Amino acid sequence: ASYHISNLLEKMTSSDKDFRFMATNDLMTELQKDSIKLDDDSERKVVKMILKLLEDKNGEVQNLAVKCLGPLVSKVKEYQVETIVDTLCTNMLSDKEQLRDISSIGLKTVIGELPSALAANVCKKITGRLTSAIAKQEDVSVQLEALDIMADMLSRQGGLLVNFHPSILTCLLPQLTSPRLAVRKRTIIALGHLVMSCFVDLIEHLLSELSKNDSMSTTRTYIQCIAAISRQAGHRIGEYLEKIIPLVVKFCNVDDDELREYCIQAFESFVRRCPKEVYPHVSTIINICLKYLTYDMSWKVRRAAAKCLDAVVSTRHEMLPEFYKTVSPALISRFKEREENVKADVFHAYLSLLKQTRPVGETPLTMLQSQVPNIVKALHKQMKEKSVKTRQCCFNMLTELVNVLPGALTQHIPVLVPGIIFSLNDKSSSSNLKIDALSCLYVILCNHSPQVFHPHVQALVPPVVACVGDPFYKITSEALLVTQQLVKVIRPLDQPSSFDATPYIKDLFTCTIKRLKAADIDQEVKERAISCMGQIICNLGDNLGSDLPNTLQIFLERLKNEITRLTTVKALTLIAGSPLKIDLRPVLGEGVPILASFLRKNQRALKLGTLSALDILIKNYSDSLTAAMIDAVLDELPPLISESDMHVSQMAISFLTTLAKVYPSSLSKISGSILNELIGLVRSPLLQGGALSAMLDFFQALVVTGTNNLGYMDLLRMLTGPVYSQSTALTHKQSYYSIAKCVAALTRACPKEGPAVVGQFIQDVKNSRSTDSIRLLALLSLGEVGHHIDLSGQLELKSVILEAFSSPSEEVKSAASYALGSISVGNLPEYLPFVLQEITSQPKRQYLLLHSLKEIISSASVVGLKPYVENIWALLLKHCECAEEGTRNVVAECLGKLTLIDPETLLPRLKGYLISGSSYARSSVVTAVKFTISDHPQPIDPLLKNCIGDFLKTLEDPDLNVRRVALVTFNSAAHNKPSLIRDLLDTVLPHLYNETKVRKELIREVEMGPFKHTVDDGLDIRKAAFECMYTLLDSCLDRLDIFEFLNHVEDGLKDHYDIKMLTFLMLVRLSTLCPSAVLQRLDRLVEPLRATCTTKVKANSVKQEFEKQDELKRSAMRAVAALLTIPEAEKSPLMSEFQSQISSNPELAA
């Protein structure tokens, strides 16, 4: 309100400090909301009072007056802002100590509360006053404040002030020679804040200036000035850097104490650029500077040199071998010591080089093991020193060393074990030194082998007991981990051991019980102690005394927590299944119920841990089980097992499997509850591999053992019944496969077979009111059981098979083919001649049993096939008939699968048939070698490599029909294995480019003379060729030839619609993969897509063709956007005219 403003003015005048303070607070609050009642007239007095409150009296009123100025500036108008700016400027430019600093603080809130057009004229005046304020006249404090607010204005206002930039240049450049040492630094900050603000001509100008200025002038702060300006330039100062490089090395040549500063220049200039020759220059200079110790102020030089070494290594990874070998051993190892700091950052440089010898001729491992000896002498020598930082740095070096080299210092363990004992003793220096020493000990113990350890472990025990007994809990936890590793090292429960350990078990067990029964320490030390004691019991429990039951009850007691639960469960898994069996009857009796309760915590890790613990207990111990806790856990599983977690389901199923061969009553309990739940689960379509094998075992064991009214008869009716009543497929696809595999496992569980096979026979042959679902189920389960249990005679196999084969539903035919394929393996001598005879007999069963034969070869054995394989391949060659191309495909797949086994003798015949066969024969052989390609490495690689190379290099220039076939094979090969093409890429390019271009012999300009159709008959090969080009840049890019690739993606841009879109995507990816290798032909590719975004369509057409052309134009515009996504390196060809039609395309594409 206006009255409120009147009141606060009155208070301020009266001069009452309490009233002044509260009036200022009220002013700030009312200005913050919406400047309640601030008219032109009232504004003239409030700013006057604000300035007066700034100038007059108590500092409390002053800060609140500075705060009001903030909201004022933001909620006031253009004249008053300018006025208060001028007043602050004059206050800081004149005398009066206090006015200067309070006005400087105020002017900061001005450019902080005002960002634009409103602030443009505002900051112009500030710059105008500051330029006169930074005059060369000696006003030390005035320039201090002036450059402060000056660099401030640049830091916060960078998108503006572009016009005043030359003016601030002419007054900032001559300010770098002033005698006072601080204003020179302030000017460097000013030029940095000036060069952030995107003004190109300016920077080139000042760079030429300092270039001409390098004329023997005694000034080091200007050297650090160019250093910092290069620092702030970032990624645009490469050429100017190449310019200054001779200057900086020359200025470092002359002996001076500011070699530190010129090395700062060198390392920064290099750290923020990725060159190909600058690193040698920089490296040469700092090797000199690191050798520079003579006899002070020379330490900073070596510090800078070591920081530069660090940068060098961490950045030029591709240059590692020679530089590593020639600088790192000598320089770093010889100078692996000095006073406090250059030594430390030399270790830091070697830590970055250790991480560069980590991929995690002369491999990195070789030069690493070359480094190892001198390294161990140097770090031991450093261990002789007393400083805590020295030992900590050596500990970090050791930790990283064994992390990049498993063996590392295997022969040096005797050398460095005493250093570890020494660092684990008195003379204080615990801090983080104890943590580092214990971590290094743990890493050394775990990574190498105990073989060199047992002596120096037997010489190691008492100090780690001392660290365990140490009051600090972090050192206690690290020592607990070290004891756990040591006990893993003295025991070897896997490899033979001979070392006696009784006193060490005594002492370690003693400290572990002392630490364990605390119930008053942090959670980390508690978990570490629990795990350590569990390992103690598991490894060394055979020599242990009567404290085992006490510690075991202690484990029970500590288990019932919210943090210790997971660690206790893990220790219980570890304590079980141990060569040294531990009496775990009380634990079982009191833990199986508590683990069952643990199950209902919805914690995935907890669920898995308790499931594994229960499984392993029931597996090995299997002695102290009674009805109560097993009933509890079996009641606990049904909530646990669900579709949402197949791995937890698998673990629970495995627990069920093991418990099945342990408790007879549990089997019936499982029968009821778990059978209900798993019947719910089986119909789910995600049963696969892990869980599938698990459930298969579950049913096998459950049926083979005694179960409550559950076996073959009962379960078989409770398996088919559901799907039979389902009738119309209520599932999707996988329930049938899962049920068939479950039925097969159940059948092979108890071989009282013959009823079920005859029943499935009836189901498959009882055509009356039998749903296709029923038929599928029958055929699938039949084939699955014939797979292992040779169905042999069992009534009519043949009849049922062919009957189901002639089905009107394609899925039933596929099931019949799969069933026959599975039947043939197991009774091959009987069922395979059937396959040959029927394939050569009927022409539809030809194709269908060819699919069945593919299944046969895929899932057959590897020993009982050879003469049968020869007959199969004889028929396959004879059955190259071209009735349908699908028959060609399946016969090619069969040939490939046959080639997979014993390729050595069969492959040369295949190549000969390529050479002497017909066009369809060449298609068959090349498709067979196409699908001979795997997805993962196989022992066929070398022979297949060379021979498919011959296949592709011979079959890439034949007839158009066989051409596209070999092209799709090469596409598959390129996508799958880059490691079998290699040199073939160069031989493929010409053949591929021959058909890549348009062929003016196959268009034929026919089938509509007057009406002008252009049927291509070569677009099939063209599409396949461009698909190979996609997989080319997708897999092999480094050695691919770029120029021809780009020329013919241009010719593809001149091709038809599908090739147009494929070339658009090719261009997008290739511009992304290699930007510089696309800039060369960016303008050349621009011509086609520019002609594409201008072609119009006559109104005679229909709107669907318009949507088609809009799709083409949108793809072209996306290609243009991708070409623009290159880091703005062209800004050249035509720059995207704005028109009424095209301009919509980028608007809708953004």
Partner: protein
């Protein structure tokens, strides 16, 4: 005209369009057919022509395309479907020109669909929506897509063309193409997603899982574009997002190994940024990420802010906190691209765990004092400035600034006045940075302490000039006694008065008399427990050093030897127990540079112990100092509690200083409002402290509380 002419026209037009569609229309003319259309449409008989069009098109489709696609359902099924599409379209273009010439008037009169749309609809109804072709096409598309996702290569261009065909066939947009087909397609997609994710969670680690799932996400997008059509984005992205990242959110970041906590431990930096890039995309992923961040930070703080057992060095402790802060800032900078949520949560955690100790301002002040005097480690100004900025940043996320600035003023008292323990330029920089880090109820008193130094050395030079002009005596040969004020300068003890050097006594008396004649009204005195001096020893003439209590014992030794505790307590008018700290600095706990040795070598103090002098002169120069002063940085219990109670009464008195004005100016209380305003005024200074204000707002009702007192209730009290 007659029916014969029009029926012959229609018959020859049907023959011509049959030849057009049979790919044998080379021997055919277009002008004649356009004339047939003109004479058929001028007679207003377009209904029969449209019916014949529909009949011939549908009979062609059923006879040719339905037989061909069904006959080759297993060999090049997509290829023959594509060929049928191309042939149908290339007949439809010319059919379209003719029947669109007539469809102009037809659609301007009969408001029916055009000929091209009619052909599209009839093909959709007769082939694509066929009772048998639908299921086979769906099955082959799903199988080929799944086998492509497995890692094999299929004809992705064929799927492109099929998707484009369904686009053009929709005739409106995303209608038929979606609906049925999209449902099993996305069902198979989500099934595949879950089957792959459940497999991938069962490895062990998350570092490889997140890379591998990002590769899966990228490959999904690659197929979306090339293999499939132009759109197919929003539903696919949503389903893959929900089925992978939303399902793995609870468990992938809390694993014991390669979990978020572990990768924060060792210092993995690519993994954090990549996990941010993946989980910033899923809904409520950043929320659980920052929740785990806060949990880890609180655990680390409780590990570091633990009070049970205090043995940590001050500089080291705060340097460790500074490293953690800067490391987390660098983490957020690279991985989280300076996200607002993570910055806010780390600031909140810092505010929560930095105030758990009453020692945090004490330790920060110790660290700033240690790094401020003169640091050989990091001598150059850039590292000093960065350390200073990090110290101020840590000071931001910290409450109770009163004890901080009290300890800062005590540090100024200690370091500032010792001999020359300031850099002379950086203290102004510290004052300026503190001016822009907290409030401003101070800083002018620290600049007022700098005013005292300035007048001090101006008085030094003026008094030196006056002494040269006068030359009273030889007492003041080399005297630098700083003129000091009681107010700005923090209180020392009860000035345990000690023996003052007899000859310099004249110098100090001369200086005091000079100042009692300068401005007259100034009750002066000497701060005996502050300051230092230099004693010249005498084979070479070296100069020793004394720190405000050494010089008296040293002169007692120089004037006469064979003295003891009784000798130094009897004839010297000597103070209380502080003497023992003063004396032990020379003998007790000394390195091999002892300037005072005693025959009874023992840790405890005796009465009749003879004091002697041993050489122990390793520094063969004329400048050796003793460093016993300001040695311990533990800030022991008695000084802790006395400074704590001093801070307590300072807080209580400032509360009054604000409370009186917040009555005198603003309108009075509604029994629960003034405490909020008084805490708002003083939030930037300390904790609100809502009990002491409550307890003492009734402390001033007795003395100077006017107007309507806050607890008026029934009547203005």
């Amino acid at each position: 005209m007659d029916e014969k002419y029009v029926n012959s026209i229609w018959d020859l037009l049907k023959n011509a369009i049959q030849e057009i569609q049979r790919k044998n229309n080379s021997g055919l003319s277009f002008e004649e057919l356009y004339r047939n259309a003109y004479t058929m449409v001028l007679h207003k008989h377009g209904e029969k022509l449209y019916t014949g069009l529909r009949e011939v098109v549908t009979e062609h489709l059923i006879n040719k395309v339905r037989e061909d696609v069904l006959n080759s359902l297993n060999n090049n099924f997509l290829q023959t479907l594509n060929q049928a599409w191309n042939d149908h379209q290339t007949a439809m273009v010319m059919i379209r020109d003719i029947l669109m010439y007539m469809d102009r008037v037809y659609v301007q009169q009969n408001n029916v669909e055009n000929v091209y749309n009619l052909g599209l609809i009839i093909f959709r109804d007769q082939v694509v929506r066929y009772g048998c072709i639908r299921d086979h096409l769906r099955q082959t598309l799903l199988d080929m897509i799944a086998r492509e996702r497995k890692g094999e290569v299929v004809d992705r261009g064929a799927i492109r063309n099929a998707c484009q065909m369904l686009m053009i066939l929709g005739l409106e947009g995303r209608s038929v193409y979606e609906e049925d087909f999209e449902a099993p397609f996305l069902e198979m997609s989500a099934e595949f997603f879950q089957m792959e994710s459940q497999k991938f969670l069962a490895e062990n680690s998350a570092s490889v899982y997140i890379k591998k799932v990002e590769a899966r996400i990228n490959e999904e997008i690659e197929r979306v574009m090339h293999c499939l059509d132009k759109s197919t984005e929003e539903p696919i992205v949503k389903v893959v997002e929900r089925e992978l990242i939303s399902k793995h959110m609870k468990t992938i970041v809390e694993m014991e190994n390669s979990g978020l906590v572990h990768m924060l431990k060792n210092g993995k930096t690519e993994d954090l940024g990549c996990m941010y890039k993946l989980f910033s995309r899923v809904p409520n992923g950043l929320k659980t990420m920052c929740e785990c961040m806060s949990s880890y930070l609180r655990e680390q703080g409780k590990a570091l802010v633990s009070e049970e057992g205090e043995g940590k060095n001050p500089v080291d402790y705060i340097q460790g906190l500074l490293d953690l802060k800067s490391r987390f800032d660098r983490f957020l900078l690279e991985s989280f691209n300076n996200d607002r949520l993570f910055k806010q949560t780390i600031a909140g955690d810092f505010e929560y765990f930095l105030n758990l100790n009453s020692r945090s301002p004490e330790y920060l002040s110790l660290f700033i004092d240690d790094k401020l005097k003169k640091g050989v480690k990091g001598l150059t100004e850039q590292e000093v400035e960065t350390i200073l900025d990090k110290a101020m940043v840590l000071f931001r996320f910290m409450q109770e600034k009163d004890v901080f600035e009290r300890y800062y003023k005590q540090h100024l008292a200690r370091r500032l006045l010792t001999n020359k323990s300031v850099s002379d330029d950086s203290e102004k920089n510290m004052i300026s940075k503190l001016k822009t880090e907290c409030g401003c109820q101070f800083t002018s008193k620290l600049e007022g302490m700098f005013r005292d130094m300035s007048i001090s050395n101006t008085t030094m030079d003026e008094f030196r000039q006056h002494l040269q002009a006068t030359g009273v005596s030889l007492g003041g040969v080399d005297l630098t006694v700083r003129v000091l004020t009681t107010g700005y300068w923090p209180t020392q003890s009860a000035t345990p008065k000690c023996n003052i050097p007899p000859a310099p006594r004249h110098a100090f008396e001369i200086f005091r008399r000079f100042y009692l004649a300068k401005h007259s009204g100034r009750q002066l005195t000497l701060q005996h427990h502050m300051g230092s001096a230099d004693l010249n020893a005498t084979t070479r003439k070296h100069i020793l050093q004394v720190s405000t209590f050494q010089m008296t014992i040293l002169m007692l030794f120089n004037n006469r030897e064979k003295y003891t505790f009784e000798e130094i307590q009897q004839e010297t008018d000597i103070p209380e127990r502080e003497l023992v700290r003063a004396l032990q600095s020379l003998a007790c706990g000394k390195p091999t540079q002892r300037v005072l040795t005693k025959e009874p070598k023992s840790k405890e103090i005796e009465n009749g112990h003879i004091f002697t002098v041993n050489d122990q002169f390793t520094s063969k120069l004329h400048r050796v100092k003793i460093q016993t002063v300001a040695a311990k940085q533990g800030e022991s219990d008695p000084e802790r509690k006395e400074t704590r109670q001093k801070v307590d009464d300072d807080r209580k008195h400032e509360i009054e200083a604000a409370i009186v004005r917040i009555m005198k100016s603003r309108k009075k209380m509604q029994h629960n409002v003034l405490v909020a305003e008084v805490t708002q005024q003083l939030k930037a200074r300390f904790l609100p402290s809502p009990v002491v204000i409550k307890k003492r707002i009734e402390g001033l009702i007795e003395r100077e509380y006017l107007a309507r007192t806050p607890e008026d209730r029934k009547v203005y009290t």
